[PDB]
Design an enzyme around this catalytic site. Structure first.
Site, PDB file in Angstrom:
ATOM      1  CG  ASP B  48      38.628  54.299   4.840  1.00 14.89           C
ATOM      2  OD1 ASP B  48      38.903  55.400   5.363  1.00 14.89           O
ATOM      3  OD2 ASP B  48      37.504  54.043   4.358  1.00 14.89           O
ATOM      4  CB  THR B  81      36.712  61.281   8.943  1.00 24.01           C
ATOM      5  OG1 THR B  81      35.573  61.706   8.184  1.00 24.01           O
ATOM      6  CG2 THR B  81      36.235  60.547  10.188  1.00 24.01           C
ATOM      7  CG  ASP B 379      35.376  60.893  -2.388  1.00 18.63           C
ATOM      8  OD1 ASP B 379      35.030  60.761  -3.580  1.00 18.63           O
ATOM      9  OD2 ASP B 379      36.502  60.552  -1.968  1.00 18.63           O
TER      10      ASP B 379
END
Lengths: 521, 512, 521
Positions: B48, B81, B379
């Protein structure tokens, strides 16, 4: 436990040194393989620069620091002498045989067993060459593809199209009556002040020193060649006498008396011209090797005679086969027997010098290949490409069987060896697997120099199969599988036969060295 | 100590480029993993991009600004992101026009600001609308986050959970269609059960424990009273405690303590409700009157939690319990269930009405599964939020970045001046997104990227992206990589604004 | 390119570090595989010596210095928790997968392509395991072969036959009519001052604390079991009262008043004995967990009761299910309905302490396996061999399918993968080829520990082929290929199935690590 001034490795590290030397030499010569490969620079240290891709020239002329790697450099010398092509692919195979064997030796396998696997796989690979060889008769179209394949590797792929018709027509001129081809029947000449594309063929022999005099005929259609070994310059007294002079004026009287030996012999040349075919529409040429006094050059020029001087012994023998006149060591023995025949004889003109052309000979049984280039190192590069292309066509004519190129045979041999079980022992199978994967290095390197992936190119050509005999190879431009027979890419049978025989003997002796000992070092 | 001159702008590039070079391989479904060495010898293999840069200690100040902006992006959108930092680092990665060409920063800054308006107008041309009434089209959109997860079996259930929850929170009458997940969409976890048992509760669930055995277990028509003040003896204006050293005075203070507490609790039970919900705590003497009425005692409920209850059961917020009127009732509530579920005390005010809010119930076998299902639905709800705001999709798989890069190149031919050179650098900086997708797959980067530019020149730019799993070229109409437009707009606006902020700083000074 | 007080490896060298960590761990644990393998010593630093061949113990307990190798140690922990066997063969396969993949990665192949080859080869090897397993019914003769195979690796091949009949008989008694089997039904006990060959079965449960009194019966043929949690020692006042005394003697007078509550309860035990079977050839046993006053011990001893006190929690748990006595927390509720039944109860006297045997029971649903050894570490080694033998028999009865051992399955799977063409990607076959040669590490290591050649042993077992099904394996003593099914060498099906899932996931994640960064270190 050892004696002073002595060093030896009793362990297997002696093999680790020899294998490390072969892997290092493999990476140096792999980049120049193929026509798309990079070029290597040779600096003599005095400022000279030489550029060639030939594996024999790179190993012979350059000096290698590591002692063991120098032994392999001596192998390409014997390889180029028997065949003349494949010295680069010879080193790449040896480096892979020692790399694949190192994997199994680290597991505790004895080197003698691996060497037996190479011998069993070699007899099977040589049997495969007999099946895929083509018996097709040699003609102009086949020799073009053979010459183009050999020349494209040593040039920029520009002069290759020009030099192709030059090399093929040179061998076909000396080929007849099923006679073994002799490379001494063709001589290579170099010229400056011209471009690289000006290389052409010369039917006759080219000579260095030409006729210098204003009255010399620029071209002579027909004439009789007179061969003479005698010098027309000032020489020593040929009878019993000496040089006696009491002053400077008396010494000149000795010169005028000594020149009488030449002067009476010069008129013998004119006497011979008016003797045999002294009428109109005739000519005469003096090929005399040694020097000639300028008075004789001016006297013979009035009669329309083209005289030469300062020739070579090898050229005078080639001139004899072109004319047929016998060499004459004494002008008192002068007869018609020494007169030959020749065609148009003219003088080429550079920006500085001039050369003599004997061209259109009757039966010279020889020709001359003339190279022109702006630079000196360019002439050497082209000369190395010509001798390589000549031996390629010579080997294709002497051995009527040709084999496909572009890595078509190596991929085909690797598949047949996997399906072949050893008939000697079970442990010899590891030697067959190592030799099978070693032949695959050639189609791998062709993909690296062309800017393509090594894995993707090999899998596509290897996965290609059919129910009938098919020949697949690496396409350098596209990268997809390509048939070597359809695109006109061919090699020599003697090259592939000697390649498998040389790589097996040399790589075997490297694994058979148990200890490296220093004696007096 | 400090840096000044060209070293600052040249230092800000190497600081932003180094942070970006780590996560370059963290983009895509095939993204490579990473290894972090703990100070005690531990190893964290998580791939991640948010967790990697969180644990890395960065010395340079501009490197901190790269992380802090990415953390703000995660609050608004939980996707894309990593693409922000890659683009923010690539736009600054070309130092040729910054230093070697000796160009003033404001000349280059004006080029990015003009290129920003062009990248926005190009996305609206290649976009496509969306029908939000059909839940089948919303299924393939949410599956982008669901893929390569353990919820893929319950994926059909996961779509209905995030879809119906956001549609309740959305208030479209105001005109701005504001959606707030952190309040109305608040989620809690339920131990016990399986993933299939997870459903969407309509109402506001309270986790308050059952203190006393006397409470209403099940009610057909619950009654809820909402009041902010705590039930306690009335104190002074200060926090000074009452200290009584005499026994006769203790009876005077205890009588005042029992009288006021009983008086406020008497007005609460006058309406006879089923529960008492207070914002602050509840003392022990107040709970004695609550258990006597056989009603549930609930406390520690914030203002936002109380605002949702008033619109659900029809309650009313009153400052003090003495002012409670008949307007505060729980009439209309479906049921009241204090029953223990999964060895934990729950409270269900659930009803048939939609008070602009709901509650998500997470069933699961173990706490390890609950933590996996929770973050996967979070999410997914933000994906539903981004689509309902701007129902337009853009082609993914690198087709969006290449479609904009082709428009910037063609328009730069009409631009005359020194700004055309940095204006074209933005078009080549957007190619990093399709580049990392091919590099992670293993296919040749140069061969595929070159042929990709020829497709957007001839064929339509809305299709012909890059397949991440296979590595070849495929149209985006045949594949589900379509992404919301609100995510791509926020990504480009942030990547350019961050690159401009770092170019504007020519000096770093330490002082306070 | 990094922040201070940290370190990062940007290039592929970060992958080479992880590969070197697995190769180093492979060489450590490869010597303990098989019964012919050696043993590792565990030194705790306090002077405790531990000797075991179990891979789970040599990893979980021993802390590894290298950070990367510690991750694999945590994998063997989850590996032993599921199947209970194969932790040693798990590390050996992971080390070879990373070793064989390193050859292709060094050639420029991306790790993702190799990982895709493992997934395609894992499904093919898993479906091939379906045809290998045998569905034959589990009987006593087969469970012995499964027990011997599991025990022969963890012992000296001496206690094997001694522990063979102990493990097989304990499993058959606790499972009837396809009932789910639990290993918590079997108790493990250890005694000293006896030879290691004295290990035998215990039908009942071994109790720690026995009876203390000269008149206690050494053996009781029949008796009833009364479960009690009540303490018969000195206790405070049960009703509401306080300590009122004018001297030290008056305080002791209240002791008899407080003991009257307990003394009256002691009489209730004597009453119940005489009411239900209080005649000759009968007895009664007090299993009470808490302490009992010595004076109460004298009253119960005269009636023929064997008292017990100061027991543990796990003891009373098994005595409840085995005997059937209901837990009684107060003697006012004492009733004959809470009484159980038990067979011969006797206390075997050791050289130091005395333990109680409740044995000769009908269906206690509990047993005990008593281990005897001269030392402490010998008891620990045998205890690990028993639990490893119990899970081997449990998995064999639960899953009715068993697979041949001695490396017969690993060699059979390697052949089907080579003949399998890629079903997904053309370049994915390199991962299949690497996974195929990795399954061959099992027969190789068995050849080294046996003292034979690694190559000669593998070639013979691979050379075995026929029309019908033929499965051969490495014979440790002879060296020739041996059929594992005929000689009684069998392995569990869930063990071979879990290795394919575990070795694929772990070796994949190691190749997926691009860089190694330091966080806070």
């Amino acid at each position: 436990t050892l004696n002073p001034k002595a060093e030896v490795a009793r362990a297997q590290a002696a093999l680790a040194v020899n294998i490390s030397a072969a892997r290092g030499l493999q990476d140096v010569l792999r980049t120049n393989l193929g026509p798309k490969g990079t070029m290597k620079m040779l600096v003599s240290g005095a400022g000279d620069i030489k550029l060639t891709k030939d594996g024999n020239v790179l190993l012979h002329e350059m000096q290698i620091q590591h002692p063991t790697a120098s032994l392999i450099a001596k192998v390409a010398t014997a390889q180029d002498d028997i065949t003349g092509d494949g010295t680069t692919s010879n080193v790449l195979i040896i480096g892979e045989l020692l790399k694949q064997a190192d994997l199994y030796i680290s597991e505790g396998l004895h080197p003698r067993i691996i060497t037996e696997g190479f011998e069993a796989a070699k007899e099977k690979a040589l049997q495969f060459l007999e099946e895929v060889k083509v018996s097709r008769e040699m003609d102009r179209e086949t020799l073009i593809d053979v010459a183009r394949t050999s020349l494209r590797t040593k040039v920029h792929a520009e002069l290759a199209d020009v030099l192709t018709e030059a090399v093929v027509d040179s061998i076909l001129a000396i080929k007849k009556q099923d006679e073994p081809i002799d490379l001494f029947m063709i001589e290579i000449m170099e010229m400056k002040h011209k471009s690289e594309t000006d290389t052409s063929l010369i039917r006759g022999l080219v000579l260095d020193h030409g006729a210098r005099h204003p009255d010399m005929k620029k071209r002579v259609e027909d004439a009789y060649i007179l061969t003479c070994n005698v010098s027309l310059e000032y020489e020593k007294t040929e009878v019993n006498s000496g040089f006696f002079y009491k002053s400077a004026e008396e010494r000149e009287k000795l010169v005028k008396a000594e020149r009488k030996f030449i002067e009476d012999r010069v008129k013998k040349i004119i006497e011979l011209k008016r003797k045999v075919c002294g009428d109109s529409d005739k000519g005469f040429v003096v090929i005399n090797q040694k020097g000639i006094d300028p008075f004789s050059l001016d006297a013979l020029s009035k009669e329309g005679i083209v005289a030469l001087r300062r020739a070579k012994r090898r050229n005078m023998e080639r001139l004899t086969l072109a004319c047929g006149g016998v060499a004459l060591n004494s002008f008192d023995d002068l007869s018609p027997d020494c007169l030959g025949h020749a065609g148009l004889v003219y003088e080429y003109t550079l920006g500085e010098e001039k050369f003599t052309f004997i061209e259109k000979c009757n039966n010279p049984r020889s020709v001359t290949l003339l190279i022109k280039g702006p630079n000196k190192h360019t002439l050497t590069q082209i000369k190395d490409a010509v001798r390589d292309g000549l031996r390629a066509v010579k080997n294709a004519i002497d051995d009527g069987c040709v084999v496909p190129g572009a890595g078509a045979v190596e991929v085909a041999m690797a598949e047949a060896l996997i399906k072949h079980k050893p008939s000697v022992k079970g442990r010899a199978q590891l030697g067959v697997q190592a030799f099978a994967d070693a032949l695959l290095i050639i189609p791998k390197v062709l993909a690296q120099n062309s800017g393509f992936d090594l894995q993707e190119t090999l899998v596509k050509i290897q996965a290609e199969h059919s129910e009938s005999g098919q020949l697949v190879g690496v396409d350098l431009n596209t990268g997809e599988p390509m048939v070597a027979a359809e695109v006109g890419v061919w090699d020599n049978y003697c090259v592939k036969k000697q390649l498998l025989h040389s790589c097996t003997v040399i790589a075997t002796n490297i694994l058979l060295v148990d200890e490296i000992m220093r004696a007096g070092m | 100590k400090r840096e000044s001159g060209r070293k600052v702008q040249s230092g800000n590039i190497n600081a932003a480029k180094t942070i970006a070079d780590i996560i370059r391989t963290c983009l895509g479904p095939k993204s490579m993993m990473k290894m972090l060495l703990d100070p005690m010898g531990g190893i964290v293999m998580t791939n991640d991009g948010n967790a990697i840069l969180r644990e890395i200690q960065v010395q340079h100040p501009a490197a901190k600004s790269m992380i802090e902006i990415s953390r703000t992006q995660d609050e608004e959108v939980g996707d894309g992101t990593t693409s922000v930092i890659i683009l923010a680092g690539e736009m600054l990665s070309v130092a040729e026009h910054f230093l070697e060409q000796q160009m003033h920063p404001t000349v280059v800054i004006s080029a990015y600001r003009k290129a920003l308006d062009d990248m926005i107008s190009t996305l609206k041309k290649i976009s496509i609308p969306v029908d939000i009434s059909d839940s089948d089209m919303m299924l393939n959109i949410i599956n982008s986050s669901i893929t390569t997860k353990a919820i893929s079996r319950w994926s059909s259930l996961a779509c209905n959970i995030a879809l119906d929850a956001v549609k309740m929170v959305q208030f479209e009458e105001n005109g701005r269609k504001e959606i707030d997940i952190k309040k109305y969409a608040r989620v809690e976890k339920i131990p016990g059960g399986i993933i299939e048992d997870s459903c969407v509760l309509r109402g506001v669930m309270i986790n308050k424990d059952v203190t006393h055995p006397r409470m209403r277990r099940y009610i057909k028509n619950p009654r809820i009273v909402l009041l902010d003040s705590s039930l306690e003896y009335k104190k002074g204006e200060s926090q000074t405690d009452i200290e009584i050293t005499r026994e006769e005075d203790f009876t005077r203070i205890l009588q005042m303590e029992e009288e006021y507490i009983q008086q406020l609790c008497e007005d609460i039970i006058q309406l006879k409700p089923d529960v008492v919900i207070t914002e602050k705590g509840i003392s022990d003497l107040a709970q004695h009157y609550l258990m006597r009425a056989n009603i549930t005692a609930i406390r520690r409920v914030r203002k936002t939690d109380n605002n949702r209850i008033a619109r659900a059961c029809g309650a009313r917020i009153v400052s003090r319990p003495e002012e409670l009127r008949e307007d505060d009732v729980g009439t209309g509530a479906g049921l009241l269930e204090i029953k223990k579920i999964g060895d934990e005390y729950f409270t269900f005010i659930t009803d048939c009405k939609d008070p602009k809010a709901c509650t998500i119930l997470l069933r699961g076998a173990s706490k390890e599964i609950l933590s996996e299902v929770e973050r996967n639905l979070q999410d997914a709800m933000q994906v539903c939020r981004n689509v309902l705001l701007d129902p337009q999709l853009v082609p993914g798989g690198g087709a969006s970045e290449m479609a904009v890069a082709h428009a910037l190149t063609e328009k730069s031919k009409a631009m005359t001046g020194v700004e055309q050179w940095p204006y074209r650098a933005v078009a080549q900086a957007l190619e990093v997104i399709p580049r990392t997708l091919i590099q992670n797959c293993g296919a040749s980067t140069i061969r595929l990227l070159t042929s990709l530019r020829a497709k957007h020149t001839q064929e339509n730019c809305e299709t012909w992206g890059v397949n991440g799993e296979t590595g070849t070229l495929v149209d985006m109409k045949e594949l589900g990589i379509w992404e919301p437009l609100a995510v791509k707009l926020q990504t480009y606006k942030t990547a350019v604004e961050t690159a401009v902020l770092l170019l504007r700083i020519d000096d770093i000074v330490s002082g306070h």
